[PDB]
Amino acid sequence: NLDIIGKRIEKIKQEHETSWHYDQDHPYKTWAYHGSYETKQTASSMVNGVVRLLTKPWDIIPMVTQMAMTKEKVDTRTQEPKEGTKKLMKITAEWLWKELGKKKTPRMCTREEFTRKVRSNAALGAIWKSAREAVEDSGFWELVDKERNLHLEGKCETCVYNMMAIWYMWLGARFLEFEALGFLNEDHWFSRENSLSGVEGEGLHKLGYILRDVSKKEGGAMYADDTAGWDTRITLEDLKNEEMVTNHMEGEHKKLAEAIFKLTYQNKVVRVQRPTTVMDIISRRDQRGSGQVVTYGLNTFTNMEAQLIRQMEGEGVFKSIQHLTVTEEIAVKNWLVRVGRERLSRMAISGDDCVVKPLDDRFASALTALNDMGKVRKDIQQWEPSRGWNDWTQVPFCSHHFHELIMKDGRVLVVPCRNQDELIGRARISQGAGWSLRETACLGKSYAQMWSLMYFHRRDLRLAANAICSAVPSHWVPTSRTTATHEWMTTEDMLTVWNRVWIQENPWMEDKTPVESWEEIPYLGKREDQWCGSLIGLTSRATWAKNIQTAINQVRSLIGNEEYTDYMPSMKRFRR
Ligand SMILES: O=C(CCC1CCCCC1)N1CCOCC1
Ligand SMILES: [Cl-]
Ligand SMILES: [Zn+2]
Ligand SMILES: [Zn+2]
CATH class of the missing domain: 3.30.70.2840 (Flavivirus RNA-directed RNA polymerase, thumb domain)
Incomplete structure (x- = not known):
């Protein structure tokens, strides 16, 4: 004290x-x-006018427009875990630091x-x-x-x-x-290669392929239980x-x-x-009260530990959290040595966010250790069994779900997705004061190039991305005030970047034949696009698309006499 x-x-x-x-x-x-x-002092979300002028149909969608408008849990307490729980956590943590440390050397930054x-x-x-x-x-x-x-x-x-x-x-x-x-982050201790359950340094273009690889394991449902206020339950x-x-x-x-x-x-x-x-x-x-980057690595560590223990509970490695017998201790140690690395491979863990494919569905009702460690699930009664997912394409992870998308040439893309109102609403928002028109335009271009790389399969976002890139001077450098791998932060041709990320460097793509044009790159099905928030089908969206050059010209007239490129003819409908 x-x-x-x-x-x-x-x-x-x-x-x-x-x-x-x-x-x-x-x-x-x-x-x-x-x-x-x-003392005497205080922050509002400011609108990005370049993105908003190029997304007019969303001006009347409250789920977008409300995003720009507008401590009873920090003051709460967690009980001390039982003696059996404390033993399981210490054994598991000792084992896990040793595994993470086998191919890494701690060092000062x-x-x-x-x-x-x-x-x-x-x-x-x-x-x-x-x-x-x-x-x-x-x-x-x-x-x-x-x-x-x-x-x-x-x-x-x-x-x-x-x-x-x-x-x-x-x-x-x-x-x-x-x-x-800093070594935990700087030297990638939570990389998938080094931690087996981690995804540190994996872009959104990797996460779907990682979940599909977990789905290939024999076992039960995929479980994606969120913790209520993880940082307050440490x-x-x-x-x-x-x-x-x-x-x-x-x-x-x-x-x-x-x-x-x-x-x-x-x-x-x-x-x-x-x-x-x-x-x-x-x-x-x-x-939890640390810097955000150390918080991420230690949350990942403690979540990996907590989920291995829930897997042990489901598999019957220990009978009760009240107390571990001497022989349960040796059983737990032996489980970790024998199958620990295989059980880590059955998880995708990003700080407090996890996906687990256990050996079978006993995991669903294995709740005594999870509750006693204080990692109480969100949106479910303390003792109700977890609801699992039968299809990896339905599992939530890192605020996304993932689609399997087949190119006209037969090759398979696994793409990130989320409700489109969330994506458009976020791109229309900026933080902080003193933004010039050029800085606002360069932030819009960052969002556009992210959409072209990650969300190309959404009709409305590929169109709006092309419009924004057409409206912002071609050589102006994309910017962010706060910076996964951000391959869209570049002045390189985005077709060249798309080929590098999705074909050349993609370890799940055997055929490395480059794509020659954006028309070779597929969309979701029309009905799936609409399910995930597309406005295709609405008269408002049709007027926007047909009149897009008028919107592009409005923004070019505000920015002034600069060098611009027309990217709209990279799309079939504007290609004559
Ligand atoms: O159903 C449609 C077109 C849907 C298509 C779906 C694929 C992408 C382009 C758009 N309309 C109703 C509104 O007026 C325009 C025509
Ligand atoms: Cl499902
Ligand atoms: Zn100090
Ligand atoms: Zn989707």
């Missing part, structure tokens, strides 16, 4: 010595409250690597003006140094979370987290099992990683804005 967090609390107290007060009307129940102090990431724009949940200035000033690195030596001494002064769920920290605390734990036992990665480290690295887990993950200090405007300095031990 206060020995580990007291120093951080002490420091904040004095910078606001004029404002400190133990408020008696504090709303916190599960979060430890320490004090308050005076460097100021050079950190500096390069900030100078190429990447979300570091951070709070000098921007990060680029701090990384160039040596005063920063001396603050970083002072904290670094405090961590080697087993103490913390400045690693404090700023709520807004995204846990922003000052750039220095972000650096120390990256130095100790227990102190989960944090202790994640910490065991430090058992694989040495020297300075081992000490620096032990401090991140001990001082910042297992004992957090947070500042929250409460209107009543006051700053609430609160603490707690449990729950």
Whole structure:
């Protein structure tokens, strides 16, 4: 408690010595409250006018238009798991870090690597003006140094979370987290090659083929149970099992990683804005509160662990979570050594998101360990058996489903898909202030090129993508303010990129014959396109398509006298 967090609390107290007060009307129940102090400040979703002017039919669709308009779970608690559950998790976690570590070497990430990431724009949940200035000033690195030596001494002064769920920290605390734990992401510990259940660094063009490969295994239904508020269900036992990665480290690295887990993950200090405007300095031990990239890898680790244990329960490897006998321990260890890697291969796991094809359907009602670990399912009663999926093309994963699409030449594409209102609504939205017309156009072009690569099979998106690319100057570079593999972020011909991604580099495509034109690239069936939200069939959509050059010309007239390319004749209907 206060020995580990007291120093951080002490420091904040004095910078606001004029404002400190133990408020008696504090709303916190599960979060430890320490004090308050005076502040005055806050974010809306702004519309992308280039995308909206080229998607007129969607201006009257509320599921699109409502997307641009407009903490009772963070303040909740999770009970301590039983002794049998704690044993299953420790055995499984010990085994899993060893498997992940067989072909990888833990290592520190460097100021050079950190500096390069900030100078190429990447979300570091951070709070000098921007990060680029701090990384160039040596005063920063001396603050970083002072904290670094405090961590080697087993103490913390400045690693404090700023709520807004995204846990922003000052750039220095972000650096120390990256130095100790960045290797999990930088060296791809959760790649499918290295973790068997992971998909880290797999583009949306890979995920469907991965689910189809899981479907080929003999076994029961495919299960895709969502957890209710995963980050809030991470227990102190989960944090202790994640910490065991430090058992694989040495020297300075081992000490620096032990401090991140001990001082910042297992004992957090947070500042929250409460209107009543006051700053609430609160603490707690449990729950996920890390940088988004470390959060992703540790969520993947703990989900892999939790799902192997649910598979053990279904297969009868242990009888009760109350307590593991001595021989159940050896049975669990022996299961992991004998079939653990095969059982990992039966899963696709992306942080809190999973798909599992178990040995049989006993898994559906194997719920005691899952509930006792705190990983309570969404939208179902605690003890009701899970509903599985009989067809891999129906399974939800990473906000998508996947279609099997046969090209006129017989070759098979497995493509990503989601309701089209969600795709159009998201492309019509931008975040942050000070967007020029050129920057807004380049963000529209990023969405368009993503649609041409991932969603070419949706009639409306291939047409709207061609229109946006026709309306934005041909040499202007696609941009995003926040950056899976983003192959659409390029000024290369998108037909050349399509061929590279779907044919040349696609390990599921044996015939490498290049496609010569967009007319060789198929769509979903007309009825399937309509099922997944297409407006084909509506008079509004027909007027848009027939008059698209008028919409393209409206946007070109706003941007002004620039060099443009007409991409519409790459489509049959505009090709004479
Ligand atoms: O049913 C249709 C055409 C559907 C087709 C379906 C395939 C893609 C192109 C469009 N119309 C009703 C509205 O007026 C225009 C004609
Ligand atoms: Cl189904
Ligand atoms: Zn610290
Ligand atoms: Zn679909």
